[PDB]
Every structure is written in structure tokens, then in C-alpha cells.
Amino acid sequence: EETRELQSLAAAVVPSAQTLKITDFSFSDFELSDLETALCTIRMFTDLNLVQNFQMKHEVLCRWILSVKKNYRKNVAYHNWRHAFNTAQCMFAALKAGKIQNKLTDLEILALLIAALSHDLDHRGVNNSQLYCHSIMEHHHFDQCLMILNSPGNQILSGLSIEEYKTTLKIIKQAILATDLALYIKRRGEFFELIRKNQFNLEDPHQKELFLAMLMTACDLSAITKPWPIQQRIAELVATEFFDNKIPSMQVGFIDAICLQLYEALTHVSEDCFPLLDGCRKNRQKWQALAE
Ligand SMILES: CCCCCCCCc1nc(-c2cc(S(=O)(=O)N3CCN(C)CC3)ccc2OCC)[nH]c(=O)c1Br
Ligand SMILES: [Mg+2]
Numbered sequence: 130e131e132t133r134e135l136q137s138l139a140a141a142v143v144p145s146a147q148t149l150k151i152t153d154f155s156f157s158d159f160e161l162s163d164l165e166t167a168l169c170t171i172r173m174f175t176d177l178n179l180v181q182n183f184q185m186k187h188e189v190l191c192r193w194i195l196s197v198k199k200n201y202r203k204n205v206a207y208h209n210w211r212h213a214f215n216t217a218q219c220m221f222a223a224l225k226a227g228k229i230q231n232k233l234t235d236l237e238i239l240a241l242l243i244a245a246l247s248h249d250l251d252h253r254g255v256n257n258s259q260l261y262c263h264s265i266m267e268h269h270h271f272d273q274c275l276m277i278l279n280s281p282g283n284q285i286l287s288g289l290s291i292e293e294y295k296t297t298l299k300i301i302k303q304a305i306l307a308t309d310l311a312l313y314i315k316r317r318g319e320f321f322e323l324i325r326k327n328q329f330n331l332e333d334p335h336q337k338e339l340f341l342a343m344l345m346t347a348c349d350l351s352a353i354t355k356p357w358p359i360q361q362r363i364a365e366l367v368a369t370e371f372f373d374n375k376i377p378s379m380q381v382g383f384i385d386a387i388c389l390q391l392y393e394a395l396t397h398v399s400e401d402c403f404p405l406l407d408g409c410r411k412n413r414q415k416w417q418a419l420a421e
């Protein structure tokens with residue numbers, strides 16, 4: 130039932146990005162089977178021109194996607210394959226519809242897509258899990274990512290040169306590390322401060338790296354931006370993982386403390402990322418109304 134899954138995936142037709150709606154910031158995955166998410170994931174790679182520019186063989190990409198999917202735990206309510214899949218979908222939408230793509234190199238785009246998909250690998254749940262605060266969990270996710278990338282039949286980066294490979298690995302690792310909330314909160318001020326003074330510049334390597342970090346977090350939290358019926362559903366998953374009527378005020382606090390400023394910053398960098406900011410605002414209104 131495993132080469133069977135790979136067999137079906139590799140033989141399947143891959144519908145267009147438009148058809149699959151993966152270009153929409155409002156995308157949801159509730160009605161999709163695992164096979165269909167795999168198909169959407171192929172489409173993200175091919176439409177970012179990654180299959181072409183880095184010579185990936187179809188059967189390798191398919192095997193790699195299936196390995197990644199398999200190394201998330203289904204019994205974990207929120208931190209599972211569908212979350213990673215959604216995080217990647219948002220990266221794709223921000224690159225395409227949000228027009229971030231033109232601001233980045235091909236290697237950067239390759240790394241973010243892989244990192245988005247891999248960023249929570251083997252997660253066991255926020256409770257089912259350090260005093261050092263050295264991003265232990267994120268190191269483990271990257272380690273898992275690297276292992277899958279090096280597995281026989283799964284080497285989607287085999288087509289890159291040695292120098293290519295090292296730089297993309299570095300970006301992938303920084304990107305996954307960035308998804309540690311502690312790190313996001315540390316580095317936030319700098320990003321906000323820079324945009325505040327109109328001093329933000331992507332040509333500076335350091336600010337470029339800072340932006341990739343912020344982008345990762347924006348995609349990671351992207352459920353908070355979804356249409357109301359979708360956000361309510363995802364909040365339901367987050368709630369069961371966390372505690373495996375006080376929820377509305379919690380959601381408002383979360384949106385204020387962590388989310389709103391990020392999506393505001395993102396829209397300054399790219400106007401077309403506005404729908405994430407807008408969606409987050411509409412959700413704040415809805416949760417706040419419930420808070421009474
Ligand atoms: C890069 C992001 C880091 C990992 C974050 C893990 C999950 C994020 C999340 N967290 C919350 C949330 C966050 C909080 S909280 O105020 O930040 N808080 C979080 C830590 N906790 C053990 C106590 C409560 C409380 C309730 C929440 O949701 C209940 C439905 N809500 C969300 O919609 C989302 Br999405
Ligand atoms: Mg994480």
C-alpha cells in the first residue's frame with residue numbers, strides 16, 4: 130500500500146494551480162484527500178519552476194513528498210501533515226499572488242518551499258513533548274528534513290552543484306529555525322523598526338535573511354488569516370492539541386500580540402499580501418464579538 134501510493138501519485142495527472150485554487154490566500158484543504166494534497170504539492174514545485182531549474186525527476190519528487198507526508202503524525206490534532214501542507218500553500222500564494230517571488234532568487238524559493246513543508250516534521254504536539262531555550266524542536270525538525278533529503282530515491286536536490294546545495298541547506302535550516310516562536314519574538318523588533326523608518330532593504334544580505342525568517346512565520350501562522358468558517362475549524366484543532374468559552378479572548382490576544390503586526394509588516398513589503406492582513410483583521414472582529 131506504499132509503492133501503491135507512490136504508483137498512483139506518479140501516474141496521476143497534475144491539474145493546474147488555478148484549478149486547484151492553491152493561488153488563493155483563502156485556500157482550505159478540508160475537502161482534499163492525502164493524494165490530492167500530494168498533487169497540489171507537485172503543482173507548487175512545478176509552477177515555481179523548481180522541477181525545471183533543478184532537474185528533478187518526477188518519481189523522486191513524488192517519493193520525497195510522500196516521505197515528508199509520512200513523517201508527520203496523524204494522531205496529533207494540529208501539528209500534522211495538513212498544517213505543513215497549508216504552510217507551504219501560503220508560501221506559494223505569497224510568492225505568486227503576493228508577488229514575493231520576483232524579490233527572491235531561485236535557490237531561496239526552493240529552500241522556503243522545502244522548509245515550509247518540512248518545518249514541523251515528526252512533531253508530537255505542544256504538550257506531548259529545553260530550559261536552555263535553544264530551539265531544540267526546530268533543530269529536530271531540520272534534522273528530519275535533512276534525513277529525508279538524503280534518503281535513497283528521495284534526493285530532490287541531487288541536481289544542484291555542491292555550492293548550490295550548501296547554500297540551500299543553510300537557507301532551509303535558518304528558515305526552519307525561524308519558526309521557533311521565541312526566535313520570531315526576538316527578531317521582530319528589528320524588522321518592524323526598519324520598515325517604520327523606511328530603511329528596509331532586501332539587497333542587504335542581513336535584511337534579506339531577516340525577511341525570509343518573517344515570511345516563514347507568516348506562513349506558519351496563516352490559519353489565523355483564513356475565512357471565518359475555516360479559522361473556526363482550525364482553532365478547533367489548535368484547541369484540542371493544546372488541551373488534549375475562554376477561547377475567543379485567547380484568540381484576540383494571540384492576534385494582537387503576535388499576528389497583526391507581522392501581516393501589517395508583510396503588506397508594507399508587498400502590497401499584494403494584503404489579503405493575509407485583511408483576513409486576520411476580519412477574524413479579530415469575529416472572535417472579539419464572541420468574547421461577549
Ligand atoms: C511560528 C509559530 C510558533 C508555534 C505556535 C503554535 C500554535 C499557534 C496558535 N496559537 C493559538 C493560541 C495561543 C494562545 S497563547 O496566548 O499564545 N498561549 C500559548 C502558550 N500556552 C501554553 C498558553 C497559551 C492561546 C490560545 C490559542 O488558541 C486557542 C484556540 N491560536 C492559534 O490560532 C494558533 Br495558529
Ligand atoms: Mg513549529
Ligand SMILES: [Zn+2]
Nearest residue numbers: 248249308349
Ligand atoms: Zn508550524
